[PDB]
Design an enzyme around this catalytic site. Sequence first.
Site, PDB file in Angstrom:
ATOM      1  N   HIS A   1       0.846  -1.184   0.000  1.00 13.39           N
ATOM      2  CA  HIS A   1       0.000   0.000   0.000  1.00 13.39           C
ATOM      3  C   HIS A   1       0.886   1.239   0.000  1.00 13.39           C
ATOM      4  O   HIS A   1       1.364   1.682   1.046  1.00 13.39           O
ATOM      5  CB  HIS A   1      -0.945   0.017   1.202  1.00 13.39           C
ATOM      6  CG  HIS A   1      -1.938   1.137   1.163  1.00 13.39           C
ATOM      7  ND1 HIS A   1      -3.029   1.136   0.324  1.00 13.39           N
ATOM      8  CD2 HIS A   1      -1.991   2.305   1.850  1.00 13.39           C
ATOM      9  CE1 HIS A   1      -3.719   2.247   0.497  1.00 13.39           C
ATOM     10  NE2 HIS A   1      -3.111   2.975   1.418  1.00 13.39           N
TER      11      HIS A   1
ATOM     12  N   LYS B   1      -6.685  14.896 -11.913  1.00  9.67           N
ATOM     13  CA  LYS B   1      -6.644  14.555 -13.328  1.00  9.67           C
ATOM     14  C   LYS B   1      -6.912  13.070 -13.560  1.00  9.67           C
ATOM     15  O   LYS B   1      -7.490  12.691 -14.579  1.00  9.67           O
ATOM     16  CB  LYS B   1      -5.294  14.943 -13.926  1.00  9.67           C
ATOM     17  CG  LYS B   1      -5.004  16.435 -13.863  1.00  9.67           C
ATOM     18  CD  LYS B   1      -3.641  16.775 -14.450  1.00  9.67           C
ATOM     19  CE  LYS B   1      -3.574  16.447 -15.933  1.00  9.67           C
ATOM     20  NZ  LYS B   1      -2.322  16.946 -16.559  1.00  9.67           N
TER      21      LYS B   1
ATOM     22  N   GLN C   1     -10.956   8.582 -10.753  1.00 10.83           N
ATOM     23  CA  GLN C   1     -11.656   7.440 -11.321  1.00 10.83           C
ATOM     24  C   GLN C   1     -13.122   7.449 -10.903  1.00 10.83           C
ATOM     25  O   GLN C   1     -13.555   6.628 -10.100  1.00 10.83           O
ATOM     26  CB  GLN C   1     -10.974   6.140 -10.890  1.00 10.83           C
ATOM     27  CG  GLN C   1      -9.591   5.963 -11.500  1.00 10.83           C
ATOM     28  CD  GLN C   1      -8.804   4.825 -10.882  1.00 10.83           C
ATOM     29  OE1 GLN C   1      -8.954   4.517  -9.700  1.00 10.83           O
ATOM     30  NE2 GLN C   1      -7.953   4.193 -11.683  1.00 10.83           N
TER      31      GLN C   1
ATOM     32  N   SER D   1      -9.731   1.934  -8.639  1.00 12.05           N
ATOM     33  CA  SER D   1      -9.145   0.706  -9.162  1.00 12.05           C
ATOM     34  C   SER D   1      -8.364   0.012  -8.052  1.00 12.05           C
ATOM     35  O   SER D   1      -8.046   0.622  -7.033  1.00 12.05           O
ATOM     36  CB  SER D   1      -8.250   0.995 -10.367  1.00 12.05           C
ATOM     37  OG  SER D   1      -7.206   1.891 -10.036  1.00 12.05           O
TER      38      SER D   1
ATOM     39  N   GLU E   1      -3.857   9.818   1.103  1.00 13.25           N
ATOM     40  CA  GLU E   1      -4.368   8.529   0.660  1.00 13.25           C
ATOM     41  C   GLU E   1      -5.201   8.734  -0.603  1.00 13.25           C
ATOM     42  O   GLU E   1      -6.235   9.401  -0.553  1.00 13.25           O
ATOM     43  CB  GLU E   1      -5.210   7.877   1.758  1.00 13.25           C
ATOM     44  CG  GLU E   1      -4.413   7.419   2.972  1.00 13.25           C
ATOM     45  CD  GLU E   1      -3.485   6.253   2.669  1.00 13.25           C
ATOM     46  OE1 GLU E   1      -3.617   5.645   1.587  1.00 13.25           O
ATOM     47  OE2 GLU E   1      -2.623   5.945   3.519  1.00 13.25           O
TER      48      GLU E   1
ATOM     49  N   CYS F   1      -2.219   2.199  -6.401  1.00 13.94           N
ATOM     50  CA  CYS F   1      -1.781   3.065  -5.311  1.00 13.94           C
ATOM     51  C   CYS F   1      -0.438   3.722  -5.621  1.00 13.94           C
ATOM     52  O   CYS F   1      -0.238   4.903  -5.343  1.00 13.94           O
ATOM     53  CB  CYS F   1      -1.689   2.280  -3.996  1.00 13.94           C
ATOM     54  SG  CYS F   1      -0.552   0.869  -4.002  1.00 13.94           S
TER      55      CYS F   1
HETATM   56  O1  LIG Z   1       3.012  18.719 -15.133  1.00 13.88           O
HETATM   57  P1  LIG Z   1       4.338  18.467 -15.817  1.00 13.88           P
HETATM   58  O2  LIG Z   1       5.382  18.195 -14.757  1.00 13.88           O
HETATM   59  O3  LIG Z   1       4.737  19.682 -16.612  1.00 13.88           O
HETATM   60  O4  LIG Z   1       4.241  17.211 -16.797  1.00 13.88           O
HETATM   61  C1  LIG Z   1       2.958  16.818 -17.251  1.00 13.88           C
HETATM   62  C2  LIG Z   1       2.524  15.595 -16.452  1.00 13.88           C
HETATM   63  O5  LIG Z   1       3.595  14.627 -16.404  1.00 13.88           O
HETATM   64  P2  LIG Z   1       4.256  14.247 -15.015  1.00 13.88           P
HETATM   65  O6  LIG Z   1       3.276  13.496 -14.145  1.00 13.88           O
HETATM   66  O7  LIG Z   1       5.468  13.375 -15.260  1.00 13.88           O
HETATM   67  O8  LIG Z   1       4.694  15.488 -14.275  1.00 13.88           O
HETATM   68  C3  LIG Z   1       1.266  14.976 -17.037  1.00 13.88           C
HETATM   69  O9  LIG Z   1       0.926  13.793 -16.311  1.00 13.88           O
HETATM   70  P3  LIG Z   1      -0.376  13.792 -15.392  1.00 13.88           P
HETATM   71  O10 LIG Z   1      -0.786  15.200 -15.027  1.00 13.88           O
HETATM   72  O11 LIG Z   1      -1.509  13.126 -16.128  1.00 13.88           O
HETATM   73  O12 LIG Z   1      -0.103  13.019 -14.125  1.00 13.88           O
HETATM   74  C4  LIG Z   1       1.450  14.671 -18.509  1.00 13.88           C
HETATM   75  O13 LIG Z   1       0.326  13.931 -19.022  1.00 13.88           O
HETATM   76  P4  LIG Z   1      -1.145  14.550 -19.252  1.00 13.88           P
HETATM   77  O14 LIG Z   1      -1.395  14.727 -20.725  1.00 13.88           O
HETATM   78  O15 LIG Z   1      -2.180  13.583 -18.724  1.00 13.88           O
HETATM   79  O16 LIG Z   1      -1.318  15.877 -18.550  1.00 13.88           O
HETATM   80  C5  LIG Z   1       1.682  15.976 -19.247  1.00 13.88           C
HETATM   81  O17 LIG Z   1       1.731  15.783 -20.662  1.00 13.88           O
HETATM   82  P5  LIG Z   1       1.222  16.947 -21.608  1.00 13.88           P
HETATM   83  O18 LIG Z   1       1.133  18.245 -20.834  1.00 13.88           O
HETATM   84  O19 LIG Z   1       2.191  17.110 -22.752  1.00 13.88           O
HETATM   85  O20 LIG Z   1      -0.143  16.622 -22.164  1.00 13.88           O
HETATM   86  C6  LIG Z   1       2.969  16.631 -18.767  1.00 13.88           C
HETATM   87  O21 LIG Z   1       4.099  15.864 -19.177  1.00 13.88           O
HETATM   88  P6  LIG Z   1       5.286  16.582 -19.900  1.00 13.88           P
HETATM   89  O22 LIG Z   1       6.066  17.419 -18.916  1.00 13.88           O
HETATM   90  O23 LIG Z   1       6.215  15.554 -20.493  1.00 13.88           O
HETATM   91  O24 LIG Z   1       4.761  17.469 -20.998  1.00 13.88           O
END
Ligand SMILES: O=P(O)(O)O[C@H]1[C@@H](OP(=O)(O)O)[C@@H](OP(=O)(O)O)[C@@H](OP(=O)(O)O)[C@@H](OP(=O)(O)O)[C@@H]1OP(=O)(O)O
Length: 266
Positions: A88, A202, A205, A146, A107, A150
């Site tokens: 977990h 973001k 779920q 899901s 959590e 975790c």
């Molecule tokens: O917020 P950042 O640090 O600038 O990076 C984000 C983030 O990636 P990280 O989790 O590695 O930080 C998003 O991931 P999540 O928010 O979903 O967790 C990722 O994907 P999303 O499309 O779902 O937002 C998104 O990509 P992008 O903004 O190009 O759509 C973008 O990654 P990048 O820094 O590589 O651009």
Amino acid sequence: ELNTEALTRIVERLESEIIDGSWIHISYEETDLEMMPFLVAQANKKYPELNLKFVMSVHELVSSIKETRMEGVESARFLVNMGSSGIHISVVDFRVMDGKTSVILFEPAACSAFGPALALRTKAALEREQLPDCYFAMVELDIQRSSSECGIFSLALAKKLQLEFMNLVKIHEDNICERLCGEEPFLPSDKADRYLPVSFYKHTQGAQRLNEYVEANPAAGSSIVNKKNETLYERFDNNAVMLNDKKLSISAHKKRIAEYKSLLKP
Ligand SMILES: O=P(O)(O)O[C@H]1[C@@H](OP(=O)(O)O)[C@@H](OP(=O)(O)O)[C@@H](OP(=O)(O)O)[C@@H](OP(=O)(O)O)[C@@H]1OP(=O)(O)O
């Protein structure tokens, strides 16, 4: 000693399992645990100010919290495996503010069952390290539904805890001033929605769960959440699947794939 060959095979299975729908009754916890050291190392390289540590027990967490305070660090995060005979993985945000130390355990899932007990267990574990002016709080998010995600949720939130530094001053401030949880043992989700920014939700779920967040943050519905210029709602739909006439989110499962693939990229 990252076995790239093995990881590559794994990535293909993850994508395959999404397409055939078997992902829902497969557990990925064990693999997440194995990959986590690399995933954490990856996150730190990407974000030098993140200060992320992977700890494998509550004891290793609280002793690491003591170390981090001692070294003069003022901002850090911890991925902690709280389970013993199981996995977990949660995320802890660490922040020294004024003279006082704030520790908040997040959590991703719900805490209705044994939330109070676990919160008291972790609080007491930290008290034993005897840190002066150290304040602890546990926060229920209820965005994971899901069964085995975790690790992914905690890893993602860890990076967001860094990026949303200023937006998280208030919850740390109220934790220190003891205005956060009060009588209640931990912070319930509806209360957390008033504190936390949109970027935390973001991977939520549940459409209903998102509706509950935007009711506390009207603007959150039509707020851009990524470089693809899609809103919180637009993104939720663009990462969903139909199984047995029920709309489910595979966002976190897709995030695992992204995280793994990044380790393969030179
Ligand atoms: O917020 P950042 O640090 O600038 O990076 C984000 C983030 O990636 P990280 O989790 O590695 O930080 C998003 O991931 P999540 O928010 O979903 O967790 C990722 O994907 P999303 O499309 O779902 O937002 C998104 O990509 P992008 O903004 O190009 O759509 C973008 O990654 P990048 O820094 O590589 O651009």
